[PDB]
Design a binder for this molecule. Structure first.
Ligand SMILES: NC(=O)c1ccc[n+]([C@@H]2O[C@H](COP(=O)([O-])OP(=O)(O)OC[C@H]3O[C@@H](n4cnc5c(N)ncnc54)[C@H](OP(=O)(O)O)[C@@H]3O)[C@@H](O)[C@H]2O)c1
Ligand SMILES: NC(=O)c1ccc[n+]([C@@H]2O[C@H](COP(=O)([O-])OP(=O)(O)OC[C@H]3O[C@@H](n4cnc5c(N)ncnc54)[C@H](OP(=O)(O)O)[C@@H]3O)[C@@H](O)[C@H]2O)c1
Lengths: 296, 296
């Protein structure tokens, strides 16, 4: 069954359908639209698709309905089970895709999961890249994300224009799962950098320091970090909103620990950070930004 | 007993004597010499004073001998007991200082220690500021240190030209001990940022990632940090040299934990970092840079 034309010509072989219009996904998809690649969106909560429909983007009834109409499906949903649902569920991408479609998972999970998604997709003649990102909500909005990619090198090149719409530095990491691998490494660092900021701030408050001055000093050598630059201003204002959700970091850390166990590496800091974030979720603060640790 | 003239006119009331020509002290003192403030040095190991003597700087026989010849004594020795020795030992600064001399401790210890040094010094008519620094060896060499100062505000202003010779951003934190307080806050962040880098790198190596690419990704949003910028290149090369000594970080963290205990604040990350660095010292690696944690 063929279909009517959409925003992006078929002959481009670059029609993109985007699944998951969240804190990251909405801005990423908007950038794709600005660049002329976005044909369609799907979001579980329909209301988030409204601003896209208002710009003429096709709003799909399901992932399958989206896949049948595009050449590249980008997924920016929460966790690996969520990716499994959108790709392999009853009305998932595989039910509508044609062979040669490429799936790009830009969410964070693990190398093992990326390899599994690729293997399953391959049965349907579907290609796969894992291209998780760093730079946060701000990067997504600004289009400056650093994107780290695993998969066929030829596909990385083919899709570079698409990645460039959303990000600035686009790095090919290696075969499938190597993007998630780099992301997990990144998350160890982000988590611990965040714990570092939160603990320093707790100490600074206990010591009665002037927060204007604390912020000035910390925004430099070499205490300074991405976590501080992205989140200290919000944190000082008591804005605990994401940002990056605590539950998502907890999930990332779990994947970090699984890899570390498999490989015989001891990561005591990552283990602590996982515990702290697990507790934050348990306590009901899973939807707050990670910068709210210790302050929720 | 009056003395012959030295490099810096007495009428300036800005003659500086520098005690502790280590990784930080040598470059800091050199900057003071370039700026025309350095009259004298003292170092326990005489050989380190040679490059200063070659430029005409008076090499003192003791801290007392130095103090009698200068208006400002800057101390950049290792730990608080070392400061006590140079200030209050048998031939310490107090034995040669005249009332009105100002002591500036630029080393890292604690607010309690700064207050104690000031109180003891005050008996002799000696003024005191705690002005610890951040920016590392590189900052010291480049003259770009961020300097955080506790003490009389009037003295902070008086000494600004001196601080500016060594640093760029000079921040008045508050009364005596407030400089060390900010430094301790900074150290929580530096320690955890360092653990973050080391753990990420350990994971990256386990995952077989290309270190060129790992470095590129980490040198950005928002995994990026001062620790990464200062030390990742050395670490990738296997250069474990300080930099900032592990034993010194261990000492800083101990002071952090004392304050946290006094004030009822729980800092589980700082506690872990203290344990890790304590172990590093126990293992014989106390003189390596902090970036060598996990790799020594
Ligand atoms: N936020 C950051 O700073 C950041 C940075 C880099 C990477 N990441 C990673 O990127 C991914 C998305 O993060 P985010 O911050 O955009 O999260 P978010 O704001 O929570 O958005 C999650 C999105 O996924 C959708 N979704 C979740 N489960 C689903 C399912 N089972 N079926 C269909 N749709 C589903 C949500 O739909 P609804 O709208 O219906 O809820 C929403 O569109 C996560 O893996 C996160 O770890 C986040
Ligand atoms: N390195 C960094 O990145 C950095 C950055 C900011 C702050 N700091 C802090 O700055 C201070 C100095 O650090 P550093 O890296 O310069 O250390 P360092 O290289 O180990 O130098 C220590 C200096 O103190 C002297 N010293 C130590 N104990 C002494 C004593 N009892 N009597 C007399 N002199 C003594 C040493 O003399 P000898 O030459 O005879 O050994 C040396 O000159 C430390 O408190 C450190 O925590 C360091």
């Amino acid at each position: 069954h063929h279909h009517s034309s959409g925003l992006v010509p078929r002959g481009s072989h670059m029609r993109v359908g985007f699944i998951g219009l969240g804190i990251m996904g909405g801005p990423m998809a908007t950038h794709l639209l600005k660049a002329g690649f976005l044909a369609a969106v799907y979001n579980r909560t329909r209301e988030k698709t409204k601003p896209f429909a208002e710009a003429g983007v096709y709003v799909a009834e399901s992932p399958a309905d989206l896949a049948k109409r595009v050449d590249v499906v980008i997924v920016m949903v929460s966790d690996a089970p969520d990716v499994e649902q959108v790709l392999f569920g009853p009305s998932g991408v595989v039910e509508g895709a044609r062979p040669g479609l490429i799936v790009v998972d830009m969410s964070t999970n693990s190398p093992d999961w990326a390899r599994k998604f690729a293997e399953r997709l391959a049965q349907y003649g579907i290609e796969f890249l894992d291209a998780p990102v760093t730079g946060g909500q701000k990067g997504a909005i600004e289009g400056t994300l650093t994107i780290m990619v695993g998969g066929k090198e030829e596909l990385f090149h083919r899709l570079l224009p698409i990645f460039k719409a959303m990000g600035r530095d686009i790095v090919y990491m290696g075969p499938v799962g190597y993007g998630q691998a780099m992301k997990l490494v990144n998350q160890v660092v982000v988590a611990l950098n965040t714990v570092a900021m939160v603990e320093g701030l707790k100490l600074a408050k206990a010591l009665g320091l002037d927060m204007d001055k604390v912020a000035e000093v910390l925004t430099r050598g070499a205490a300074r970090s991405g976590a501080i630059e992205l989140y200290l201003p919000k944190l000082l204002k008591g804005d605990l909103s994401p940002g990056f959700k605590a539950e998502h970091l907890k999930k990332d850390l779990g994947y970090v620990l699984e890899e570390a166990r498999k490989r015989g590496v001891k990561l005591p800091g990552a283990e602590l950070a996982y515990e702290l974030y697990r507790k934050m979720v348990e306590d009901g603060a899973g939807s707050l930004g990670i910068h709210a640790l210790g302050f929720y």
